[PDB]
């Protein structure tokens, strides 16, 4: 059991040894570090607190997240670590391992292993019904005027209210996502790069998050 962070950078091609073309995701686990170790003794759950991008030291008169407010620095000086931009946890891990304040290098992973992922989805604005939900559009000609709009909401003069679960134009994008049952292809420790079969919810340079699958079959 294990899990790391990373960054979607791009997708490519890569071949199996039977000649089967195999698509692939690229991800970068650069500068992963463990920061804090949240026991069940105090909090009520056993987990691992983590950090990914090196950022810089304390402000002087300074400004946004490129640099670091003191409390972050007060958290990263703690375990002999440089301050980090993205912090995330990982429950369901062998907390007996992972001393506070080390690295979670890609070598924990291995070719052939199965995984899930997590990440934000993509930017998408006020999208209509049929693009948000996939409803079916209406007729063009034969004189109509109902091309794309969401249809008749509800029932009648009775059942006056409109039920909550309906389907309407709102934003389509920002959502936590998970994609069970992907596989790993390769682990290049040189560039500290990993490769994941299939494709992941992310934009370029976005956040991506990984862990060992749960539905192995058990």
């Amino acid at each position: 059991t294990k899990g790391i962070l990373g960054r979607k950078i791009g997708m490519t091609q890569v071949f199996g040894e039977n000649g089967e073309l195999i698509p692939v995701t690229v991800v970068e686990a650069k500068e992963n570090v463990v920061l804090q170790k949240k026991t069940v003794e105090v909090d009520g759950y056993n987990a691992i607190q983590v950090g990914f991008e090196d950022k810089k030291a304390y402000k002087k008169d300074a400004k946004s997240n490129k640099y670091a407010n003191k409390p972050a620095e007060g958290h990263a000086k703690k375990a002999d670590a440089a301050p980090k931009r993205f912090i995330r946890e990982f429950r369901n891990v062998d907390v007996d391992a992972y001393e506070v304040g080390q690295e979670v290098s890609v070598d924990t992973f291995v070719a052939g292993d199965v995984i899930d992922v997590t990440g934000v989805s993509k930017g998408k604005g006020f999208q209509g019904a049929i693009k948000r939900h996939g409803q079916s559009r209406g007729p063009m000609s034969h004189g109509s005027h109902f091309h794309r709009a969401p249809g008749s909401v509800g029932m009648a003069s009775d059942a006056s209210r409109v039920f909550k679960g309906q389907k309407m134009p709102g934003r389509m994008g920002g959502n936590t996502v998970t994609v069970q049952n992907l596989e790993v292809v390769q682990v290049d420790t040189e560039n500290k790069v990993i490769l994941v079969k299939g494709n992941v919810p992310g934009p370029k340079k976005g956040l991506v998050e990984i862990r060992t699958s749960i539905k192995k079959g058990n």
């Binding site: 091609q13 071949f15 000649g19 089967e20 073309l21």
Partner: protein, 122 residues
């Protein structure tokens, strides 16, 4: 992709030249088809002679599709036309010849009598 009310050529010794795709056997209301997918067709014209006639209705097995198939090696293929072949659930044809070359992925479906005849398995 091949679907309902789609007209095709043919390949065999039938006495027939083109057909119509009524239904595209599979599942619970498939719309589509590709190489390998058996279908239920009929006949909209005929050359003279031959066993089959106008107004008839029989099955067929698709081959020579115009939006070809992706092989798992990452290679593709494309013909120009669409076509089919007549069949009787021996999975062996009525006909005696096959013009118009064949797509090989039929082999997974265990069709070999028409693959005996086709220039060429491709």
């Amino acid at each position: 992709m091949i679907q309902q009310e789609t007209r095709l050529k043919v390949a065999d010794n039938s006495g027939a030249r083109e057909v119509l795709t009524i239904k595209v056997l599979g599942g619970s209301g498939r719309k589509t088809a590709n190489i390998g997918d058996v279908i239920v067709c009929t006949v909209k014209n005929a050359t003279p002679g031959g066993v089959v006639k106008k107004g008839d209705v029989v099955k067929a097995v698709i081959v020579r599709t115009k939006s070809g198939v992706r092989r798992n090696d990452g290679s593709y293929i494309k013909f120009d036309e669409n076509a089919c072949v007549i069949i009787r659930d021996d999975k062996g044809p009525r006909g005696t010849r096959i013009f118009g070359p064949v797509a090989r992925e039929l082999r997974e479906g265990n069709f070999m009598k028409i693959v005996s005849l086709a220039p060429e398995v491709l």
